[PDB]
Structure 1
Amino acid sequence: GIDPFTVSKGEELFTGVVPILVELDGDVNGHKFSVSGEGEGDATYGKLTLKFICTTGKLPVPWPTLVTTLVQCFSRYPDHMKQHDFFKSAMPEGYVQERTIFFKDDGNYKTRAEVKFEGDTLVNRIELKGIDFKEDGNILGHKLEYNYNSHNVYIMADKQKNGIKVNFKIRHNIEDGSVQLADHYQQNTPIGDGPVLLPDNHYLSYQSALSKDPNEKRDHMVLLEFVTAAGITELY
């Protein structure tokens, strides 16, 4: 395992503001692209502030479709739920997060990411592969609104892999007023061989706001997000 002498482990690494670096390499129907992101996370408040840039030119998919792929260790876990925080418990060695995201009546993304500390920086390194998309559909045809809605993300233990399974749905807004469903199937597994916290069933409550940097001429996304764990509740 880790050196114990190690000063901070698991949740101890998140008591303050932590710098975040995100790196994504993607290929959707052979459209290749890369995204980098930077900012900070303050788990005490469940607060994420991040700016992402497409480093290869124009992003060939809508930015909103990448939000879930682009650090659940920054969730605010209530003190009364702290024993259910898998994500921080896996740190600093980290965890692998894998998803399949099914876009209804369109293609799918498959993603694999490793989330771990490199010194003081929490790093999310991702590979994304998309296939079976319609060239003129809502994704490759860029028919989605640049916005986001609030969601619950449902977490349960996966004892076989010493990890968790996560499931949720995102409904992106199409420019004609309709909805593009993106059904998310997710699993996380620790990278290290030490103990992790395997949670009871619960959820994370997300709020997300997308904006633009008026001084940024590259294709980019500014993201402000708040994340709180809930769903496990006589004192009063």
Structure 2
Amino acid sequence: KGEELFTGVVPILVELDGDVNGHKFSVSGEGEGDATYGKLTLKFICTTGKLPVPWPTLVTTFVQCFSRYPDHMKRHDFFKSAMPEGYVQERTIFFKDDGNYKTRAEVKFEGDTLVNRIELKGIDFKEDGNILGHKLEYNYNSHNVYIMADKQKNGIKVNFKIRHNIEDGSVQLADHYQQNTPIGDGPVLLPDNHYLSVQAALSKDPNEKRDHMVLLEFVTAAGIT
């Protein structure tokens, strides 16, 4: 079991290659993951200067193998069973009445480090919309992430909507269609339906001058008796 791999606080590296409406950018992240607790701490920096999109819009794109699966759930944990060979995470994110993000990532162990490498392509945003106009609050809400087994592809099928709060007191929904599929030949662990409970909290390093985002994530699995 790759569950034996998350026994401690694992180190995390995130590399995202990006392009939204042709605006290229790149972000690097680093931090650590305690799956036992159910907790991530990550910090990100735009290395091409300014991020052309609000930071909150990439939180879900920037490692669900650090979800805390209670003891009677531990076998619905595809995310870890797929390790250290890892898996591929593919998504489409439709921002309601605005553009979309299309992401492919590989999440696998690269030594002791758990690494998430992301290709993101984003099209059809409105330059004076909520996303390209930077009208989102620098903050994040609490969501459930709903997980189904997809034996067909022998991976999973995940869905949820993010509720991005808008300056004007409004909500911008972002609808996530997600699938994860195993990299290795050595069998993933297909789950009964459950959900992950995700609270994310967003901050700034007062000493960091580059465009960055600090992230604290708390996740714990749930739904099964």
Q: Confirm or deny a common fold (TM above 0.5).
A: yes
**How far is 1:121 from its partner?**
0.1
How high is the sequence identity, in percent, across the aligned residues?
98
**How far is 1:131 from its partner?**
0.4
**How far is 1:64 from its partner?**
0.2
Distance in 2 (CA, whole Å) between partners of 1:73 and 1:225 is 12
User: In the alignment, which residue of structure 1 is the partner of 2:83?
Assistant: 91
Which of residues 169, 177, 181 in structure 1 aligns to 2:173? Answer: 181
Distance in 1 (CA, whole Å) between partners of 2:215 and 2:176 is 20
Normalised TM-score (structure 1): 0.95
Number of residue pairs matched? Answer: 225
Distance in 2 (CA, whole Å) between partners of 1:93 and 1:161 is 17
Distance in 2 (CA, whole Å) between partners of 1:17 and 1:112 is 25
SS at match of 1:213: coil
User: In the alignment, which residue of structure 2 is the partner of 1:3?
Assistant: none
User: In the alignment, which residue of structure 1 is the partner of 2:191?
Assistant: 199
Which runs of 5 or more residues in structure 2 are unaligned?
none
Which runs of 5 or more residues in structure 1 are unaligned?
1-8
**How far is 1:165 from its partner?**
0.1
- Specify the structure having the higher radius of gyration (Cα): 1
Distance in 1 (CA, whole Å) between partners of 2:168 and 2:216 is 26
SS at match of 1:22: strand
Distance in 2 (CA, whole Å) between partners of 1:169 and 1:45 is 25
Q: Deviations over 1:65-117 (max 9, x none)?
A: 00000000000000100110000000000000000000000000000000000
Q: Deviations over 1:99-148 (max 9, x none)?
A: 00000000000000000001000000000000011111100110100000
Q: Deviations over 1:44-80 (max 9, x none)?
A: 0111000000011000000000000000000000010
Distance in 1 (CA, whole Å) between partners of 2:128 and 2:141 is 24
**How far is 1:162 from its partner?**
1.0
SS at match of 1:155: strand
- Root-mean-square deviation (CA, aligned residues, Å) is 0.5
